[PDB]
Design a protein around this nucleic acid. Structure first.
Ligand code: NA
Ligand code: NA
Ligand code: NA
Length: 157
DNA sequence: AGGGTTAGGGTTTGGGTTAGGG
């Protein structure tokens, strides 16, 4: 039952137990529900060290869940800058589209994570990428009344 | 129970559309 144990340790932030389970042959890309992998759970929850351990053990940086979301989508939307940075330096697809049409930049924009927006752009995020409703991150900033984010994105339009 | 950038967390317990458990 090592997959179940790994998923739990990764979401719960038990880095020691993650390392032990990986040493015992746990599948780094194990999934029990909704295509959720340990890296995706750790990235959404904010567990940086576990993200680092899983990547070192070969975790698929671009694994997708039931909604087509990659770990970078979750880290970007849930405001985990350092995880966003580690994922990107390890090959995360900055322009990955989920099944809702969103890129990580769309999620960072929707949730007001300016530093993440800037890091994504630094790593090549498509500023003109449109979601399912044909909206760009800039459009989202205007809809949400985010003056600071609109200022960052206006400078790049 | 119910919602959800949902997969835990808010007294408390099992739903779901894919669909378990303090
Ligand atoms: Na629930
Ligand atoms: Na649930
Ligand atoms: Na609950």
């Amino acid at each position: 039952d090592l997959g179940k144990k790994l998923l739990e340790a990764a979401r719960a932030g038990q880095d020691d137990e993650v390392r032990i389970l990986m040493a015992n042959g746990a599948d780094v890309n194990a999934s029990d529900k909704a295509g959720l992998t340990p890296l995706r759970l750790a990235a959404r929850t904010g567990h940086l060290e576990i993200v680092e351990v899983l990547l070192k053990y070969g975790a698929d940086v671009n694994a997708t869940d039931i909604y087509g979301r990659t770990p970078l989508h979750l880290a970007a939307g849930y405001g985990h800058l350092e995880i966003v940075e580690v994922l990107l330096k390890h090959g995360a697809d900055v322009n990955a589209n989920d099944q809702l049409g969103d890129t990580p930049l769309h999620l960072a924009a929707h949730w007001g994570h300016l530093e993440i927006v800037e890091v994504l752009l630094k790593y090549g995020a498509d500023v003109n990428a449109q979601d399912k409703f044909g909206k760009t991150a800039f459009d989202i900033s205007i809809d949400n009344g985010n003056e600071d984010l609109a200022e960052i994105l206006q400078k790049l339009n």
